[PDB]
Every structure is written in C-alpha cells, then in structure tokens.
Amino acid sequence: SPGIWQLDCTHLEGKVILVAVHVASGYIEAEVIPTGQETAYFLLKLAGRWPVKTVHTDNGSNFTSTTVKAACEWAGIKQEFGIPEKELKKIIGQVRDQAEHLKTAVQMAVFIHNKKRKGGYSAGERIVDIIAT
C-alpha cells in the first residue's frame, strides 16, 4: 500500500544509521544518529514529507520508547511488529572517499539508491507513481 514503511538500524564507523524503506517502491531515507529521541524526530520529519501509515520493525526496541510512541500518536503512525540495506553499505563504500563525514556519504548513497534505475523506474519515480495513483 502507499503508506507502509519498514524501519531498521544499520552500523558503520561506530555510528548508528537509521534506514526507512518504503516497502512497495524500495525508496529509502536514512540518517546517522547518536536514542529514542532521534528516531521520534526522524519519524516525525518522514511523516510530514510522505504518507506514513504503518511502520514495521524486526524486534521489540521501538515498542519500549515512550518518545517513539508519542511521535507515532501525534502523526497517526501505527507501529507493527514483523516486517511485511547491504546495497546501502555497498554504495557508501563506492562514495566514502568523496566525503569527509560519514553522514554525507550516507546521503550520497541514498541519492544514488533512489535516483538510479534497476530502462525502467527509479525508487524515487516509483514512490511518487504509487502515491499519485
């Protein structure tokens, strides 16, 4: 559906990368964070940009953050357990020597992930096509 996202944690250079995948398109947003506060904020910003209706996670961590819960309540996000990111670290590796900070290489890699084609449609075209329909 248009508003189903999967949320996960990956790691590089001792830092946490928050990764939201729009399931039907493969579209991603990611951010390097230092906590629940950061995830709540990331979710609130993602919800003002796109239709975010259900967020899937793989474990119980996000069900225990009183601050994730308030962000979800505010923005009208349902959390669901049991989801309906090596590529991401692949493209970070392709670009890492183009940027001084990890966070910059992440955003360069999101850019490439979302803009490239698999002829055909990019994840960026795909999420907009799904939301238009």
Q: How far is the CB of 111 from a second copy (least distance, A)?
A: 3
DSSP code per residue over 40-84: HHHHHHHHHHS---EEEESSSGGGG-HHHHHHHHHHTPEEEES--
Q: ∠ CA(91), CA(86), CA(64), 5° rounding?
A: 120
Site for a second copy in 7-26 (CB under 8 A): none
Site for a second copy in 23-52 (CB under 8 A): 29, 41, 44-45, 47-49
23 vs 44 by CB, closer to ligand TXM: 44
Q: How far is the CB of 125 from a second copy (least distance, A)?
A: 8
Beta strands in the chain (DSSP E): 4-12, 15-22, 27-33, 54-57, 78-81
Which residues are at the interface with a second copy (CB under 8 A)? Answer: 29, 41, 44-45, 47-49, 74-75, 98, 103-104, 107-108, 110-111, 114-115, 124, 128-129, 131-132
